[PDB]
Amino acid sequence: MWQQAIGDALGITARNLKKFGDRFPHVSDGSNKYVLNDNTDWTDGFWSGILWLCYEYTGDEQYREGAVRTVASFRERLDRFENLDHHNIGFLYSLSAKAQWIVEKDESARKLALDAADVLMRRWRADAGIIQAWGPKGDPENGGRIIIDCLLNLPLLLWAGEQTGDPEYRRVAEAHALKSRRFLVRGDDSSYHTFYFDPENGNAIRGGTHQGNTDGSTWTRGQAWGIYGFALNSRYLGNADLLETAKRMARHFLARVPEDGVVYWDFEVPQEPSSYRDSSASAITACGLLEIASQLDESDPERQRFIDAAKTTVTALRDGYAERDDGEAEGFIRRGSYHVRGGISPDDYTIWGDYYYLEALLRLERGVTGYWYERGR
């Protein structure tokens, strides 16, 4: 049921590793070829994650060799502080260094992840009670701005807190998650992409976006980050409110899935075939649904409902968006969208979409849950 889908991903990944060399895939731009970078974006960890997932599925050393090489690259990136002045250090290091620790208990990798967590920790702004998403401290326009994807960066901090015994990691993480729940999530279970607070006292200002159609719309990837993000934090914190919020956001998302099973880029624009899609949002959501289900009681009927919804989503992606390993294609799923409003790769491969698609497949086929937390916690 999932073996063939995984098979194509394995083949594409093996071919990619040889062609990419030491470079990292980010997004495609009008073709079936990825545009590469030298480990300088916020998405490099997804490549590492893909390699580790392929290794766990196959046991094939070629995938491990590639993943280990990316980890060495990440040590170099950290000790040079190259393009790490943002909150996505979790996306970058959880799926690379922490991943290696999770997979084979490499002490060197564990330390790298901890060093990275230390850097992310310094993004906390005590006066505003939030983790600053982008820019330098005191940033005139972004100093008190949070973005919903920060939820996916909290796992690195929560993991580090458990590893070190330092209570500050969990304190900042839970505070940020709760502030996100009150202000990023809406009363109809939809969500804002970003939210602005007063840098001096942390008081709420407004919600908005530079990516969603409008400040009050529902950017699907943002909703997806909320679904998986709140569920990951609920697991670490044992916070039933965060789990409830994840479920609410999931139901909102599911009620707006179009005919072919994969979402458009925003729920509040015409849900028409000529409009851009965001296969990555559906992939992220599939993982989030399975994560939520894993935290529900076996007697809870909604548990199987969420699992079935995840399966339906993965099947929809496989059937209408998945690339077959034809020796040319470099991505797992088509029609992801980076920045529709800016016209940047709006109908393309996205390395994060590929990672979540594969993670969903590994979850369904092997019970492999990715690298957001230790296996058995």
Short mmCIF file of C-alpha atoms in Angstrom, two decimals:
data_model
loop_
_atom_site.label_atom_id
_atom_site.label_comp_id
_atom_site.label_asym_id
_atom_site.label_seq_id
_atom_site.Cartn_x
_atom_site.Cartn_y
_atom_site.Cartn_z
CA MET A 1 0.00 0.00 0.00
CA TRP A 2 2.96 2.28 0.70
CA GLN A 3 5.91 0.26 -0.61
CA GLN A 4 5.69 1.50 -4.19
CA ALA A 5 5.39 5.13 -3.11
CA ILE A 6 8.43 4.71 -0.87
CA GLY A 7 10.21 2.88 -3.68
CA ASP A 8 10.06 5.89 -5.97
CA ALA A 9 11.30 8.16 -3.17
CA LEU A 10 14.24 5.86 -2.45
CA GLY A 11 15.22 5.78 -6.11
CA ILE A 12 14.93 9.53 -6.57
CA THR A 13 16.95 10.13 -3.40
CA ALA A 14 19.76 7.76 -4.43
CA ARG A 15 20.06 9.49 -7.81
CA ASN A 16 19.95 12.93 -6.17
CA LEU A 17 22.70 12.19 -3.65
CA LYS A 18 25.09 11.36 -6.49
CA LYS A 19 24.21 14.43 -8.55
CA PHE A 20 24.00 16.99 -5.73
CA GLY A 21 27.37 16.15 -4.25
CA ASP A 22 27.72 18.17 -1.05
CA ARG A 23 25.03 20.71 -2.01
CA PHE A 24 21.46 20.88 -0.67
CA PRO A 25 18.11 20.94 -2.53
CA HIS A 26 15.60 23.71 -1.68
CA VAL A 27 12.87 24.11 -4.31
CA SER A 28 12.50 23.62 -8.05
CA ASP A 29 11.67 26.57 -10.31
CA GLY A 30 9.65 25.58 -13.35
CA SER A 31 11.16 22.14 -13.95
CA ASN A 32 11.72 18.69 -12.46
CA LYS A 33 15.14 19.78 -11.19
CA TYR A 34 15.98 21.11 -7.73
CA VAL A 35 17.83 24.39 -7.31
CA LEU A 36 20.73 23.78 -4.91
CA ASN A 37 22.51 25.82 -2.24
CA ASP A 38 25.66 25.43 -0.13
CA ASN A 39 23.80 24.98 3.19
CA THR A 40 22.64 28.58 3.46
CA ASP A 41 18.83 28.45 3.72
CA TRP A 42 16.21 27.42 6.31
CA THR A 43 15.40 24.18 4.47
CA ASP A 44 18.72 22.32 4.43
CA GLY A 45 17.75 20.05 7.32
CA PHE A 46 14.92 18.51 5.30
CA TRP A 47 17.49 16.97 2.93
CA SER A 48 19.29 15.50 5.95
CA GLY A 49 15.96 14.23 7.24
CA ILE A 50 15.16 12.58 3.92
CA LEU A 51 18.54 10.83 3.88
CA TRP A 52 18.11 9.55 7.44
CA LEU A 53 14.59 8.32 6.66
CA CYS A 54 15.84 6.45 3.59
CA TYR A 55 18.62 4.95 5.69
CA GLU A 56 16.18 3.77 8.35
CA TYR A 57 13.95 2.18 5.73
CA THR A 58 16.68 0.43 3.74
CA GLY A 59 19.75 0.09 5.93
CA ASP A 60 21.64 1.16 2.80
CA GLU A 61 24.93 2.81 3.76
CA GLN A 62 24.80 5.23 0.82
CA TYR A 63 22.01 7.17 2.55
CA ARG A 64 23.82 7.22 5.90
CA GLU A 65 27.03 8.38 4.25
CA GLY A 66 25.17 11.28 2.67
CA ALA A 67 23.41 12.19 5.91
CA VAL A 68 26.65 12.10 7.92
CA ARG A 69 28.23 14.43 5.37
CA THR A 70 25.39 16.93 5.80
CA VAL A 71 25.92 16.79 9.56
CA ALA A 72 29.59 17.71 9.11
CA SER A 73 28.39 20.59 6.95
CA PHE A 74 26.05 21.69 9.73
CA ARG A 75 28.86 21.75 12.28
CA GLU A 76 30.78 24.01 9.91
CA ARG A 77 27.67 26.14 9.44
CA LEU A 78 27.13 26.54 13.18
CA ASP A 79 30.73 27.32 14.09
CA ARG A 80 30.64 30.05 11.44
CA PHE A 81 27.15 31.27 12.45
CA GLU A 82 26.21 31.30 8.78
CA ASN A 83 22.63 32.44 8.15
CA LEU A 84 21.31 31.35 11.55
CA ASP A 85 19.82 34.65 12.75
CA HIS A 86 16.29 33.24 12.72
CA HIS A 87 14.13 30.75 14.62
CA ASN A 88 14.39 27.95 12.06
CA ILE A 89 17.49 26.46 13.72
CA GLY A 90 15.17 23.62 14.78
CA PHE A 91 14.20 22.74 11.20
CA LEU A 92 17.91 22.73 10.38
CA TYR A 93 19.36 20.81 13.33
CA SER A 94 16.55 18.54 14.53
CA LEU A 95 16.49 16.75 11.18
CA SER A 96 20.27 16.50 10.83
CA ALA A 97 22.29 16.37 14.06
CA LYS A 98 19.51 15.36 16.45
CA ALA A 99 18.36 12.88 13.80
CA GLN A 100 21.72 11.11 13.86
CA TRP A 101 21.59 10.90 17.65
CA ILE A 102 18.10 9.43 17.40
CA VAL A 103 19.12 6.96 14.70
CA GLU A 104 22.47 5.71 16.01
CA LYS A 105 23.26 7.54 19.26
CA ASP A 106 26.23 9.44 17.81
CA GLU A 107 27.62 11.53 20.69
CA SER A 108 29.21 14.05 18.32
CA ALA A 109 25.83 14.64 16.67
CA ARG A 110 24.14 15.01 20.04
CA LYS A 111 26.58 17.75 21.05
CA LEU A 112 26.08 19.59 17.76
CA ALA A 113 22.31 19.55 18.31
CA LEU A 114 22.81 20.89 21.83
CA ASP A 115 25.09 23.66 20.59
CA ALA A 116 22.42 24.61 18.05
CA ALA A 117 19.73 24.58 20.75
CA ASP A 118 21.88 27.05 22.71
CA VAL A 119 21.83 29.46 19.77
CA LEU A 120 18.07 29.15 19.32
CA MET A 121 17.61 29.80 23.04
CA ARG A 122 19.18 33.23 22.60
CA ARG A 123 16.31 34.15 20.27
CA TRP A 124 14.03 34.36 23.30
CA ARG A 125 12.94 37.90 24.15
CA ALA A 126 12.13 38.11 27.87
CA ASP A 127 10.39 41.49 27.65
CA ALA A 128 7.96 40.25 24.98
CA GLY A 129 7.72 36.63 26.14
CA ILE A 130 8.35 35.24 22.65
CA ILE A 131 10.97 33.69 20.41
CA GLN A 132 11.75 36.27 17.72
CA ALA A 133 11.14 34.72 14.29
CA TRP A 134 13.48 36.82 12.15
CA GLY A 135 16.11 39.53 12.16
CA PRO A 136 18.40 40.89 14.90
CA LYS A 137 17.26 41.74 18.42
CA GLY A 138 15.36 45.02 18.54
CA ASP A 139 14.59 44.72 14.82
CA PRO A 140 12.51 47.87 14.09
CA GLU A 141 9.72 45.91 12.38
CA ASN A 142 10.31 42.26 13.33
CA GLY A 143 11.64 42.52 16.89
CA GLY A 144 8.36 41.35 18.40
CA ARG A 145 6.99 39.22 15.58
CA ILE A 146 6.29 35.50 15.87
CA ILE A 147 5.47 33.10 13.04
CA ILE A 148 3.43 29.91 13.39
CA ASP A 149 6.21 27.67 12.07
CA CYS A 150 8.22 28.46 15.22
CA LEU A 151 6.18 25.66 16.78
CA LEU A 152 8.26 23.19 14.75
CA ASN A 153 11.46 24.70 16.12
CA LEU A 154 10.47 24.21 19.75
CA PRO A 155 11.20 20.45 19.66
CA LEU A 156 14.94 21.15 19.45
CA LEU A 157 14.67 23.22 22.64
CA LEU A 158 12.42 20.73 24.43
CA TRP A 159 14.76 17.88 23.49
CA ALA A 160 17.79 19.84 24.70
CA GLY A 161 16.04 20.58 27.98
CA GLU A 162 15.50 16.87 28.57
CA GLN A 163 19.12 16.11 27.67
CA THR A 164 20.63 18.77 29.94
CA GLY A 165 18.12 19.01 32.76
CA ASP A 166 18.08 22.78 32.28
CA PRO A 167 14.46 23.87 32.97
CA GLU A 168 14.78 27.09 30.96
CA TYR A 169 14.39 25.26 27.65
CA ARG A 170 10.95 23.92 28.55
CA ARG A 171 9.91 27.19 30.19
CA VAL A 172 10.56 29.28 27.08
CA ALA A 173 9.10 26.61 24.79
CA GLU A 174 5.83 26.24 26.69
CA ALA A 175 5.47 30.01 27.03
CA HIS A 176 5.91 30.48 23.29
CA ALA A 177 3.52 27.65 22.44
CA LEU A 178 0.84 29.08 24.74
CA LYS A 179 1.25 32.61 23.41
CA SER A 180 0.93 31.18 19.89
CA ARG A 181 -2.28 29.39 20.86
CA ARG A 182 -3.90 32.54 22.25
CA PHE A 183 -2.91 34.88 19.42
CA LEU A 184 -2.09 32.93 16.25
CA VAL A 185 -5.07 30.58 16.42
CA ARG A 186 -8.52 31.98 15.59
CA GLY A 187 -11.94 31.29 17.07
CA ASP A 188 -13.14 29.39 14.01
CA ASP A 189 -10.08 27.14 14.35
CA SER A 190 -8.26 28.80 11.44
CA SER A 191 -4.99 30.65 12.04
CA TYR A 192 -2.94 33.78 11.40
CA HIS A 193 0.47 33.26 9.82
CA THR A 194 2.34 35.74 12.02
CA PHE A 195 1.54 37.97 14.99
CA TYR A 196 3.04 41.22 16.25
CA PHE A 197 3.59 42.17 19.90
CA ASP A 198 5.00 45.24 21.64
CA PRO A 199 8.74 44.54 22.07
CA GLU A 200 8.76 46.35 25.42
CA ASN A 201 5.91 44.60 27.25
CA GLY A 202 4.78 41.82 24.92
CA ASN A 203 1.25 43.19 24.53
CA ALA A 204 -0.70 42.06 21.47
CA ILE A 205 -0.76 44.33 18.45
CA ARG A 206 -2.09 42.49 15.39
CA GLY A 207 -2.02 39.32 13.31
CA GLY A 208 -0.93 39.26 9.68
CA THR A 209 1.06 37.76 6.84
CA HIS A 210 3.36 38.44 3.92
CA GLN A 211 2.56 35.05 2.39
CA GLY A 212 -1.10 34.26 3.00
CA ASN A 213 -3.56 35.95 0.63
CA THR A 214 -4.48 38.51 3.32
CA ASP A 215 -3.86 39.08 7.02
CA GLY A 216 -7.19 37.43 7.79
CA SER A 217 -6.96 34.53 5.35
CA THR A 218 -5.83 30.97 6.02
CA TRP A 219 -2.50 30.15 4.39
CA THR A 220 -2.62 26.35 4.23
CA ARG A 221 1.01 25.68 5.10
CA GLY A 222 0.56 27.92 8.13
CA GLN A 223 -2.48 25.94 9.22
CA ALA A 224 -0.45 22.77 8.65
CA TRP A 225 2.42 24.05 10.82
CA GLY A 226 -0.14 24.66 13.54
CA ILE A 227 -1.58 21.15 13.29
CA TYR A 228 1.74 19.31 13.51
CA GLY A 229 3.42 21.97 15.64
CA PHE A 230 0.84 22.08 18.42
CA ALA A 231 0.76 18.27 18.48
CA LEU A 232 4.54 18.00 18.84
CA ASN A 233 4.50 20.49 21.71
CA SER A 234 1.58 18.74 23.36
CA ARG A 235 3.58 15.50 23.43
CA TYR A 236 6.61 17.12 25.06
CA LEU A 237 4.60 19.22 27.51
CA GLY A 238 1.78 16.81 28.25
CA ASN A 239 -0.47 19.80 27.61
CA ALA A 240 -4.02 18.76 26.78
CA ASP A 241 -4.93 22.29 25.66
CA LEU A 242 -2.28 22.26 22.95
CA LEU A 243 -3.44 18.82 21.80
CA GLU A 244 -7.02 20.12 21.69
CA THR A 245 -5.88 23.06 19.57
CA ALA A 246 -4.08 20.68 17.19
CA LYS A 247 -7.29 18.69 16.79
CA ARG A 248 -9.34 21.83 16.21
CA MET A 249 -6.97 23.06 13.51
CA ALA A 250 -6.90 19.61 11.91
CA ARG A 251 -10.70 19.48 11.67
CA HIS A 252 -10.75 22.96 10.14
CA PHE A 253 -8.17 21.86 7.56
CA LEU A 254 -9.94 18.59 6.72
CA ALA A 255 -13.26 20.34 6.12
CA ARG A 256 -11.62 22.39 3.37
CA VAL A 257 -9.78 19.71 1.41
CA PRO A 258 -10.77 19.89 -2.29
CA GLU A 259 -12.01 17.07 -4.51
CA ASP A 260 -8.60 15.59 -5.37
CA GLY A 261 -7.55 15.44 -1.72
CA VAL A 262 -4.71 17.98 -1.82
CA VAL A 263 -5.11 21.60 -0.71
CA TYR A 264 -4.89 24.90 -2.54
CA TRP A 265 -2.33 27.45 -1.31
CA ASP A 266 -4.88 29.40 0.79
CA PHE A 267 -8.38 28.38 1.92
CA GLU A 268 -9.81 31.86 1.40
CA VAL A 269 -9.13 32.32 -2.31
CA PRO A 270 -11.33 30.72 -4.97
CA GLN A 271 -10.91 26.94 -4.64
CA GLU A 272 -10.54 26.60 -8.40
CA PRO A 273 -8.34 24.29 -10.53
CA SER A 274 -6.41 27.17 -12.13
CA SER A 275 -5.31 28.31 -8.66
CA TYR A 276 -2.00 27.27 -7.11
CA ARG A 277 -1.88 24.30 -4.76
CA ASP A 278 0.43 23.53 -1.87
CA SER A 279 1.11 19.82 -1.73
CA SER A 280 3.53 20.49 1.12
CA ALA A 281 0.69 21.67 3.36
CA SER A 282 -1.11 18.37 2.80
CA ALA A 283 2.10 16.44 3.48
CA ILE A 284 2.75 18.32 6.72
CA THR A 285 -0.86 17.76 7.75
CA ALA A 286 -0.68 14.02 7.08
CA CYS A 287 2.19 13.83 9.58
CA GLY A 288 0.34 16.02 12.05
CA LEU A 289 -2.78 13.85 11.85
CA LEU A 290 -0.75 10.73 12.61
CA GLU A 291 1.01 12.53 15.46
CA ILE A 292 -2.29 13.64 16.99
CA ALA A 293 -3.70 10.12 16.66
CA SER A 294 -0.66 8.68 18.44
CA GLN A 295 -1.55 10.80 21.48
CA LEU A 296 -5.20 9.78 21.64
CA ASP A 297 -6.65 6.89 23.64
CA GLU A 298 -7.27 3.69 21.67
CA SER A 299 -10.92 3.97 22.73
CA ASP A 300 -11.22 7.41 21.13
CA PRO A 301 -13.08 6.95 17.81
CA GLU A 302 -11.50 10.11 16.40
CA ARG A 303 -8.10 8.41 16.62
CA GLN A 304 -8.82 6.03 13.74
CA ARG A 305 -10.63 8.86 11.95
CA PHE A 306 -7.44 10.93 11.97
CA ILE A 307 -5.32 7.94 10.94
CA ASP A 308 -7.67 7.24 8.03
CA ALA A 309 -7.61 10.91 7.06
CA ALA A 310 -3.80 10.76 7.01
CA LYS A 311 -3.86 7.63 4.86
CA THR A 312 -6.35 9.24 2.48
CA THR A 313 -4.09 12.30 2.26
CA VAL A 314 -0.94 10.30 1.50
CA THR A 315 -2.83 8.27 -1.09
CA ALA A 316 -4.15 11.48 -2.66
CA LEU A 317 -0.60 12.84 -2.85
CA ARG A 318 0.72 9.58 -4.29
CA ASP A 319 -2.06 9.30 -6.86
CA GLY A 320 -2.12 12.85 -8.17
CA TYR A 321 1.12 14.54 -7.16
CA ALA A 322 3.88 11.95 -6.74
CA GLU A 323 6.73 11.67 -9.24
CA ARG A 324 7.75 8.20 -10.36
CA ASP A 325 11.46 7.41 -10.44
CA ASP A 326 11.94 7.93 -14.18
CA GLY A 327 15.64 8.68 -13.85
CA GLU A 328 15.04 12.40 -14.31
CA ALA A 329 12.64 13.66 -11.63
CA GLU A 330 14.35 15.03 -8.54
CA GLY A 331 11.32 15.61 -6.31
CA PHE A 332 8.84 13.32 -4.52
CA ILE A 333 5.69 15.40 -4.98
CA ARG A 334 4.71 18.12 -7.42
CA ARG A 335 2.81 21.36 -6.94
CA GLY A 336 4.17 22.58 -3.65
CA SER A 337 4.36 26.38 -3.40
CA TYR A 338 7.05 28.51 -1.79
CA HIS A 339 5.81 32.09 -2.08
CA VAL A 340 2.69 32.46 -4.23
CA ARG A 341 2.27 36.16 -3.43
CA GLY A 342 5.85 36.88 -4.44
CA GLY A 343 5.67 34.60 -7.46
CA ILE A 344 8.56 32.49 -6.17
CA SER A 345 8.34 28.77 -7.05
CA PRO A 346 4.51 28.62 -6.72
CA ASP A 347 4.07 25.26 -8.51
CA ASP A 348 7.18 23.29 -7.66
CA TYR A 349 9.02 20.74 -5.58
CA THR A 350 9.67 21.93 -2.03
CA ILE A 351 12.22 19.99 -0.02
CA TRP A 352 10.05 20.29 3.10
CA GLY A 353 7.05 18.90 1.26
CA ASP A 354 9.21 15.97 0.19
CA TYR A 355 10.44 15.38 3.73
CA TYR A 356 6.98 15.34 5.29
CA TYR A 357 5.63 13.16 2.49
CA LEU A 358 8.36 10.61 3.20
CA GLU A 359 7.95 10.93 6.97
CA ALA A 360 4.24 10.22 6.59
CA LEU A 361 5.08 7.15 4.50
CA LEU A 362 7.66 5.90 7.02
CA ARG A 363 5.15 6.46 9.83
CA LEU A 364 2.48 4.43 8.02
CA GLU A 365 4.76 1.64 6.79
CA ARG A 366 7.34 1.27 9.58
CA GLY A 367 6.14 3.34 12.52
CA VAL A 368 9.20 5.55 12.06
CA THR A 369 8.21 8.95 13.48
CA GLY A 370 10.86 11.29 12.15
CA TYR A 371 13.27 13.31 14.25
CA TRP A 372 11.22 15.69 16.40
CA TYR A 373 11.61 13.51 19.50
CA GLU A 374 13.29 10.36 20.82
CA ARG A 375 11.77 7.01 19.81
CA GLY A 376 9.99 6.03 23.01
CA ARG A 377 9.07 9.47 24.34
#
